[PDB]
Design an enzyme around this catalytic site. Structure first.
Site: not given
Ligand SMILES: *Cc1cc2c(cc1C)nc1c(=O)[nH]c(=O)nc-1n2C[C@H](O)[C@H](O)[C@H](O)COP(=O)(O)OP(=O)(O)OC[C@H]1O[C@@H](n2cnc3c(N)ncnc32)[C@H](O)[C@@H]1O
Ligand SMILES: O=C(O)c1ccccn1
Ligand code: NA
Length: 385
Positions: A256, A319
């Site tokens: 992508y 990521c």
């Molecule tokens: C990686 C990826 C994701 C992605 C994508 C392409 C890739 C390569 N393309 C997407 C797209 O085009 N459209 C879409 O709708 N989503 C797409 N994604 C998915 C998206 O990036 C993820 O779904 C989303 O950003 C996840 O966000 P979330 O808030 O769920 O998760 P996180 O950013 O990982 O944050 C979790 C935080 O929790 C903290 N943490 C972890 N464990 C603990 C504990 N025990 N205590 C306290 N804090 C904790 C982490 O440090 C983190 O900041």
């Molecule tokens: O949700 C999406 O459309 C997406 C997810 C992963 C990579 C690119 N796009």
């Protein structure tokens, strides 16, 4: 200390949840183990894809319901966050992927009266600059999809949450959760808390807190390579694109690109492979260095098939993708009611491609935490052990 809601994780979902809880007048704490805005979880990079279209009708109805929530957020923060550069899907129209299936999605767009343009291989090459496509590659352009400003969204959510009274605490790791009949005990490396309800928005680390409670969700964590490439040839159309292909014996064979970036200097575009390979045992195994094989595959596919970019990347990153193991499931979103006693006191957001849903999932997690019910239809998304 004690709060109505404790949110574990300060990524976009945790921040959106805290905003929504706090603006409703409740006492909320967000605990983030690293820093807000960190790029070591699932929310690295500048861009994510906004799309209306989904193979599953329930999720398609949810994107249509999320668009007004994006518009409301944009108005609150006075920043356009979605830029409608287009959503281009093409390739093998029958393969089922973690992105969807082209053929089924086109039928769903027909069903829901959502506009799109159907394209043959020659049209894709002419309009968008791809080359060397198999002659039977086809797909569509959905012109209302596009790109989401990730860092602008995070800053908006942080600002709104704090302004509404949420307590946002970084550098603190939640090490244990124990729900009971009266609330939830939260232990961290720095102290302890009581909560009415806890929202788990901890990305790939969810199972760390569930497994001592006898639960485990069926997701896989993949350290996906992302890389930036210089645009070599100016182009008229530069949508988000996703190439749907049959897998190979070694990898999922999906690629992508997030398309034109309307807010950034220069003319760089981000691309990646979408490979369900080498799942991590634990997120602590991540290296934070783009996998060499993934990069050879990505740059090699671009070299042949998208010569509008210079296929020598100018920067690389990683990521963490967190995806259901079952390909019939796209998200884990619900309470832990079916997973453990007192599980209704744990609201969980546990896996999927969720950036497009951040305003929605924040609202739903807030709904579940404070009102114990949501108006949205998320029955299918309930957690899976
Ligand atoms: C990686 C990826 C994701 C992605 C994508 C392409 C890739 C390569 N393309 C997407 C797209 O085009 N459209 C879409 O709708 N989503 C797409 N994604 C998915 C998206 O990036 C993820 O779904 C989303 O950003 C996840 O966000 P979330 O808030 O769920 O998760 P996180 O950013 O990982 O944050 C979790 C935080 O929790 C903290 N943490 C972890 N464990 C603990 C504990 N025990 N205590 C306290 N804090 C904790 C982490 O440090 C983190 O900041
Ligand atoms: O949700 C999406 O459309 C997406 C997810 C992963 C990579 C690119 N796009
Ligand atoms: Na630019």
């Amino acid at each position: 200390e004690s709060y109505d809601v404790v949110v574990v994780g300060g990524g976009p979902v945790g921040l959106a949840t805290a905003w929504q809880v706090a603006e409703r007048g409740h006492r909320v704490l967000v605990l983030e183990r690293h820093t807000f805005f960190n790029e070591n979880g699932g929310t690295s990079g500048a861009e994510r894809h906004w799309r209306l279209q989904y193979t599953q009708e329930d999720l398609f109805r949810l994107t249509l319901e999320t668009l007004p929530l994006w518009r409301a957020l944009e108005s609150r923060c006075e920043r356009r966050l979605i830029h409608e550069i287009g959503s281009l899907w093409f390739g093998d129209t029958d393969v089922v992927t973690n992105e969807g299936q082209i053929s089924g999605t086109a039928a769903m767009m027909d069903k829901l009266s959502v506009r799109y343009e159907w394209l043959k291989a020659t049209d894709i090459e002419r309009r968008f600059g791809f080359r060397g496509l198999p002659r039977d590659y086809e797909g569509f352009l959905q012109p209302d999809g596009g790109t989401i400003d990730v860092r602008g969204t995070l800053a908006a959510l942080f600002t709104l949450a704090q302004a509404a009274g949420a307590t946002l605490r970084a550098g603190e790791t939640v090490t244990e959760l124990v729900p009971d009949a009266d609330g939830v005990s939260v232990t961290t490396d720095r102290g302890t808390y009581r909560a009415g309800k806890v929202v788990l928005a901890c990305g790939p680390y969810t199972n760390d807190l569930l497994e001592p409670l006898g639960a485990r969700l069926a997701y896989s964590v993949y350290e996906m390579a992302i890389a930036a490439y210089r645009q070599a040839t100016p182009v008229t159309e530069a949508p988000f694109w996703f190439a749907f292909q049959q897998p190979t014996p070694q990898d999922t064979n999906l690629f992508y690109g997030f398309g034109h970036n309307p807010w950034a200097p220069g003319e760089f575009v981000r691309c990646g492979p979408d490979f369900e390979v080498d799942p991590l045992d634990h997120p602590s195994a991540a290296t934070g260095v783009a996998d060499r094989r993934q990069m050879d595959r990505l740059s090699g596919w671009l070299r042949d098939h998208l010569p509008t970019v210079d296929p020598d990347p100018v920067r690389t990153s990683t990521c963490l993708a967190v995806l259901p193991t079952d390909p019939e499931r796209q998200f884990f979103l619900g309470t832990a009611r079916d997973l453990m006693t007192h599980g209704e006191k744990l609201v969980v957001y546990g896996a999927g491609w969720a950036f497009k849903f951040v305003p929605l999932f924040g609202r739903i997690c807030a709904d579940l935490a404070v009102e114990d019910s949501t108006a949205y239809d998320i029955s299918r998304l309930a957690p899976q052990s």
